[PDB]
Amino acid sequence: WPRVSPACAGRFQSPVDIRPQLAAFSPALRPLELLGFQLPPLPELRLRNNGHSVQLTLPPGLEMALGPGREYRALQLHLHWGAAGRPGSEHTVEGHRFPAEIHVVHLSTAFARVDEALGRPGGLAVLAAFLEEGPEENSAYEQLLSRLEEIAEEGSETQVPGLDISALLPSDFSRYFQYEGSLTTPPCAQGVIWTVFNQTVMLSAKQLHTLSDTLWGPGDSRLQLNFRATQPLNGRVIEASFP
Amino acid sequence: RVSPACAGRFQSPVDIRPQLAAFSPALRPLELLGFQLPPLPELRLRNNGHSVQLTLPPGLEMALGPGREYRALQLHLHWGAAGRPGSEHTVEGHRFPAEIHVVHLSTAFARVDEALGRPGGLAVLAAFLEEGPEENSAYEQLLSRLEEIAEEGSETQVPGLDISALLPSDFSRYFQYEGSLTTPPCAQGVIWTVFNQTVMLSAKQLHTLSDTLWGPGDSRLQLNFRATQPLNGRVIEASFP
Ligand SMILES: NS(=O)(=O)c1c(F)c(F)c(SCCc2ccc(C(=O)O)cc2)c(F)c1NC1CCCCCCCCCCC1
Ligand SMILES: NS(=O)(=O)c1c(F)c(F)c(SCCc2ccc(C(=O)O)cc2)c(F)c1NC1CCCCCCCCCCC1
Ligand SMILES: [Zn+2]
Ligand SMILES: [Zn+2]
């Protein structure tokens, strides 16, 4: 990874191990504001297998705020996962790796283009939630997972009807961890604001197997364990929106 | 064009109410590197008509944390008039005699105009100036030169000095909030760090600052502070409970 682009050996990279007892509570971290995420069924959205993950391109109008006057527009979402009987979340909590992780990537409003935001502090913000095993089938996630067989091949894509993107995220928008780090693939640009929800979302064991067993990557290898290793904080302090 | 960003919701200066400040233990001591200048090359001290400014050379590096790195561009002062305070920021309604600002540019940006309006592009360090019993010698190096730049738009060269000696010793205790520039264009996204500890000048020193320079026709350069702006739901953070 430092081979093909050396930003991946920068000092302030992601993902990181979250250690709640060492997190800094700041009352200034207000609840997350997400508007325009309840999408109608038309227009349909591009759901692509890109060889390294499954991604959903998002339209313009998904407005997000991390504070007052710190606004964002959602660009896309994608997922990280493991294999049969192996977790594949990127972030860990006290060394525990969760089954999977959703990332919703956004661009700061103050930037017109993604490539101006890269490497700039707060240019990009990601919302991250952990996916766990639960008793029920998750309806929001079945909308995406049921369509995965159709894009099993590296490079293929399909169209899915619009859905409530916020339905894919956890219950409590006032409880999260926050730090500044990087993208977790090349170019590994720094200045990315990561916000990681305290609460998880639940998927059936079948859904988690659908996600981990359906997609193929590059030759004929399985698209699995698509997570970067844990990176050192190097002096950074993870903050928390709750005592 | 009466400066459209000067009507933003999130402007500076503000009234700091310590009881409404949020303690955040993420806020570590500020670190400066390269503020101790050699005497040459000299720096340009300038009466720009609205303030006195010192332009700073390249290699003054400041950090607000790990990964939050800045380069110093300039400093300038805000002050009042005989018996009237002119700090920009207030604390629980109190206006201090004067204020120093050191304006910095993020090391993601090569030019000021790329940073303006961008979150965290510019960062200012701010400290209040009060009367103390002693002549402050770092300030004296600038204040003894104000007679040479009394005229609006004049300037003079001054030996490099310890720029960090114009600031308080205690870099641990401060307030921090997101706001704006206090002159047009008043662009938002500016990280303001305001020190708990103040800097001491002699009475004579403070009088020199307030009573020596002239502004735009033949009016004295005094009371060069903007009115305090509403927080408007922003929460000022504090590095200490
Ligand atoms: N965790 S992460 O957000 O960093 C991330 C990952 F970790 C990933 F593994 C991935 S998947 C591997 C990179 C990739 C992306 C798209 C294509 C394609 O469409 O053909 C091919 C390869 C990812 F997209 C994202 N996110 C973004 C792409 C990362 C490259 C930077 C380009 C600017 C951001 C563009 C939108 C967000 C997607
Ligand atoms: N508190 S503040 O930072 O907003 C500020 C003020 F409130 C001020 F009143 C002032 S003084 C009035 C603006 C000015 C600056 C320079 C000239 C000149 O050289 O001829 C003329 C007029 C100030 F300089 C600064 N700071 C200037 C220095 C930082 C470098 C330029 C960054 C671009 C923003 C342009 C506004 C001046 C900022
Ligand atoms: Zn990701
Ligand atoms: Zn100023």
UniProtKB/Swiss-Prot annotation, chain A:
Single GO molecular function: zinc ion binding
Membership in a protein family: Belongs to the alpha-carbonic anhydrase family.
Superkingdom of origin: Eukaryota
Cofactor(s) listed in the protein's UniProt record: Zn(2+)
Keyword Phosphoprotein: yes
Cellular compartments annotated: Nucleus; Nucleus, Nucleolus; Cell membrane; Cell projection, Microvillus membrane
Positions of substrate binding: T184, T185
Upregulating conditions: By hypoxia.
Full protein stretch here: 149 to 391 of 459
EC number, as in UniProt: 4.2.1.1
Entry protein name: Carbonic anhydrase 9
